[PDB]
Design a protein around this ligand. Structure first.
Ligand SMILES: Cc1nc(OCc2ccsc2)c2c(-c3ccnc(N)c3)c[nH]c2n1
Ligand SMILES: [Cl-]
Length: 331
């Protein structure tokens, strides 16, 4: 769809410029003459598939809107929606650039442990809000690109894009999440719950501090191999229940599991998170050596929280309320 700059919609919105494009369609900056403010309009393609996920996005955002609590404000605000020229249009507040752009701006050397902590605390609070029983929303696509600064000067963030989201027990797709941030339970073809967002969050926080993705698989096999390098072979009780366990692993005479090997990865559980983070070696690539708020003690707390977020078992993986009580967040 051609949207010219200066185009006026419905005597209300003046289109200014393109913010960006997705598989869903496009996001434009526009002036709202009624509220007298700038907004972001997400313009959904005139195709059944994209209309259908945007309709789910509108339903889930309107559901959140009716829960007035202290914890709903880490989610982008949907102001309203309308149908225009057979495109579903979602009107949001304007936010700023995304956390991937923040990383690119550091030349992928990563932000400080102190700024990582502020992001972690806001995202844990968002996930606690989505876990509200009457919401039980799984985001399903958390990644740096889907987390926006509220203001280019400041460290407030909001989660965007509920285009892949579902409520608990309303699963549609088996293949979900962006590969780098995809949970073991999704890789293993298992029924998934809100814990897949916490897995993504653990991956995101390590990446925000080191500048690089924790697990950058080129495909699902490579993804599971990179996770295993750091965390070891997933537990037997999980692999025993996993429809796609034999995509990656093999059950052994005595019902233990091992990697299926391909042509020539560090051996299982030997690419240690403590070395990735540089806990005892001045942080990622030693670049934090002697900066304040980057002591071994601060690093150990961060590492402890991440390993609770990257529990293989979605039953025992840390949950948002308990993540917020972790020592990493204690003054
Ligand atoms: C500046 C800005 N950008 C945004 O999205 C950037 C983007 C994303 C994909 S393509 C370009 C947004 C959004 C936004 C974008 C996409 N989905 C939702 N639910 C909200 C709201 N407010 C914004 N302000
Ligand atoms: Cl997805």
């Amino acid at each position: 769809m051609i949207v010219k700059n200066g185009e006026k919609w419905m005597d209300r919105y003046e289109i200014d410029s393109l913010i960006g494009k997705g598989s869903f369609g496009q996001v434009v900056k526009a002036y709202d003459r009624v509220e007298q403010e700038w907004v972001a309009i997400k313009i959904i393609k005139n195709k059944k598939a994209f209309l259908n996920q945007a309709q789910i996005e509108v339903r889930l955002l309107e559901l959140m809107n009716k829960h007035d609590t202290e914890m709903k404000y880490y989610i982008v605000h949907l102001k309203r929606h309308f149908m225009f020229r057979n495109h579903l249009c979602l009107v949001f507040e304007m936010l700023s650039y995304n956390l991937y752009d923040l990383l690119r701006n550091t030349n992928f050397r990563g932000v400080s442990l102190n700024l990582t902590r502020k992001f972690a605390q806001q995202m844990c609070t968002a996930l606690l809000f989505l876990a509200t029983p009457e919401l039980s929303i799984i985001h399903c696509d958390l990644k740096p690109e889907n987390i926006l600064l509220c203001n280019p000067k400041r460290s407030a963030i909001k989660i965007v894009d509920f285009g892949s989201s579902c409520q608990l027990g309303q699963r549609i797709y088996q293949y979900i999440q962006s590969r780098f941030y995809r949970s073991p339970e999704v890789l293993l073809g298992m029924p998934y719950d809100l814990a897949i967002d916490m897995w993504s969050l653990g991956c995101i926080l390590v990446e925000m501090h080191t500048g690089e993705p924790l697990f950058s698989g080129a495909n699902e096999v490579d993804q599971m191999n990179k996770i295993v390098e750091v965390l070891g072979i997933p537990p037997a009780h999980i692999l025993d229940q996993a429809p796609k366990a034999r995509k990656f692993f093999e059950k052994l005479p005595d019902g233990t599991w091992n990697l299926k090997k391909t042509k020539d990865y560090k051996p299982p559980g030997t690419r240690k998170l403590h070395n990735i983070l540089g806990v005892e070696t001045g942080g990622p690539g030693g670049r934090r050596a002697g900066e304040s708020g980057h002591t071994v003690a601060d690093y150990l707390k961060f590492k402890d929280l991440i390993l609770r977020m990257l529990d293989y078992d979605p039953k025992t993986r840390i949950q948002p309320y308990y993540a917020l009580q972790h020592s990493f967040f204690k003054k």
